[PDB]
């Protein structure tokens, strides 16, 4: 297990900002387009944080064109370029799966300014 | 299947089991030694010793915490004020398992669970 941990440590990202759950974050993702690699912006709300070392993940929630989109990004991947947080979320909760049915004014949460 | 599922169930339902543990631990704290079934004794180790450790750290919050698993107002005091100076320079190892025989009515493997500092 120690060896595995060691392996993880050098492979892990060294430039991850300390990001809270409920935060309005823009995720720059390296999408493939024909042959050239393109950057795509996906701005939404942090609704889940998984922390596993190298296998760490985070779920982004935003409503696109009418239908809500949940997207889990693997944090230690070179595909996810930028974790750009705009405004934090004022909740006493980590995994916000109630937003899966919450829409409109009910979808909007309080802003953390602490 | 119990792959790495630690914690011997001891037939009883979970809440009942917890209650028993609470009682058992209290008894141990009181009597310094309690004659019990070996598996039961073993199980007791992983709740009472932690409580003892907690007690070793003397504070109001700790006392409050103790006033849950151990429950009793006197037992907690004993743990803190008397069993605190009892175990000061020892890491873990507050319990001592010593097997004796069988509970003749059902032939159950009996073991004396005790606090290590029994003699003095």
């Amino acid at each position: 297990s120690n060896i595995i941990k060691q392996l993880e440590q050098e492979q892990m990202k060294q430039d991850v900002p300390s990001f809270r759950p409920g935060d309005t974050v823009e995720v720059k993702v390296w999408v493939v387009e024909g042959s050239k690699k393109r950057l795509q912006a996906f701005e939404g709300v942090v609704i889940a944080i998984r922390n596993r070392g190298l296998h760490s993940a985070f779920t982004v929630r935003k409503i696109s064109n009418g239908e809500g989109v949940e997207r889990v990004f693997q944090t230690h991947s070179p595909v996810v370029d930028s974790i750009s947080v705009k405004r934090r979320g004022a909740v006493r909760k980590a995994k916000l799966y109630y937003l899966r049915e919450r829409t409109g004014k009910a979808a909007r949460i309080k802003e953390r300014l602490n | 299947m119990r792959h790495r599922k630690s914690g011997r169930q001891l037939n009883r339902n979970s809440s009942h089991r917890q209650a028993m543990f609470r009682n058992m631990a209290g008894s141990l704290v009181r009597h310094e030694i309690i004659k019990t079934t070996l598996p039961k004794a073993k199980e007791l180790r992983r709740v009472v010793e932690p409580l003892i450790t907690l007690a070793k750290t003397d504070s109001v919050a700790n006392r409050r915490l103790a006033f849950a698993r151990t429950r009793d107002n006197e037992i907690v005091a004993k743990l803190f004020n008397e069993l605190g100076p009892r175990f000061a320079s020892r890491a873990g190892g507050y319990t001592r398992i010593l097997k004796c025989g069988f509970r003749a009515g059902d032939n159950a493997p009996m073991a004396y669970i005790e606090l290590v500092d029994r003699s003095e």
């Binding site: 297990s1 060896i3 595995i4 392996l7 993880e8 190298l54 070179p78 595909v79 | 792959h3």
Partner: protein, 209 residues
């Protein structure tokens, strides 16, 4: 070609520059020490007897100790045999590293599978369960019928019944080896291999190819 014996450190994933997650198995492929090289002249056939790990000098039994002494190397936790290809020669007092598995692209990993205990007909042989509701009387997870009637008379040998599942040395085959590490005695291979963390694994090269 000859295999090499390891031990499961566990599972992990490789993140590649292109953007493909590779679920790599980390195997502690240590210095596999030769104990005996089997031959055609006296023994009968070509094989190699290997050992991996470390056992206590006090715990190790006398005849086994003698055997080890004869060979000329330290004791591990068991002995394993590998069938030789025609064109390979090895010495008795020798140690094989992961250097031999640097050339190969595919491997076949044998391992003592996770012991499923006494598996039911559904869990063992992937049966359909009978109705959970709908009148069903104490039969939900049961075999149903086993035979036919008076014609066969018996129940056939090797029939899909409830019994011991797992706890058996079995092979997962044609697995893509990604990285080879000789510095820290590791093997890194795409996929999943039988056994738990610390399960003593048997890694053969591509006999399929």
């Amino acid at each position: 070609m000859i295999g090499l014996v390891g031990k499961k450190v566990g599972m992990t994933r490789i993140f590649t520059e292109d953007g493909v997650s590779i679920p790599v198995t980390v195997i502690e492929v240590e210095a596999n020490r030769v104990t005996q090289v089997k031959d055609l002249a006296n023994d009968g056939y070509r094989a190699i007897q290997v050992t991996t790990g470390a056992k206590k000098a006090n715990r190790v039994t006398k005849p086994e100790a003698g055997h080890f002494a004869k060979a000329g190397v330290e004791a591990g936790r068991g002995l394993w045999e590998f069938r030789l290809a025609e064109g390979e020669e090895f010495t008795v007092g020798q140690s094989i590293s992961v250097e031999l598995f640097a050339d190969v692209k595919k491997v076949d990993v044998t391992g003592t599978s996770k012991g499923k205990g006494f598996a039911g007909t559904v869990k063992r042989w992937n049966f359909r369960t009978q109705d959970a509701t709908h009148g069903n009387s104490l039969s939900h997870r049961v075999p149903g019928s086993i035979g036919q009637n008076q014609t066969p008379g018996k129940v056939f040998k090797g029939k899909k019944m409830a019994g011991q599942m797992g706890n058996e040395r079995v092979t997962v085959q044609s697995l893509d080896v990604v990285r080879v590490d000789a510095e820290r005695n590791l093997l890194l291979v795409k996929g999943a291999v039988p056994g738990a963390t610390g399960s003593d694994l048997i890694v053969k090269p591509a006999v399929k190819a």
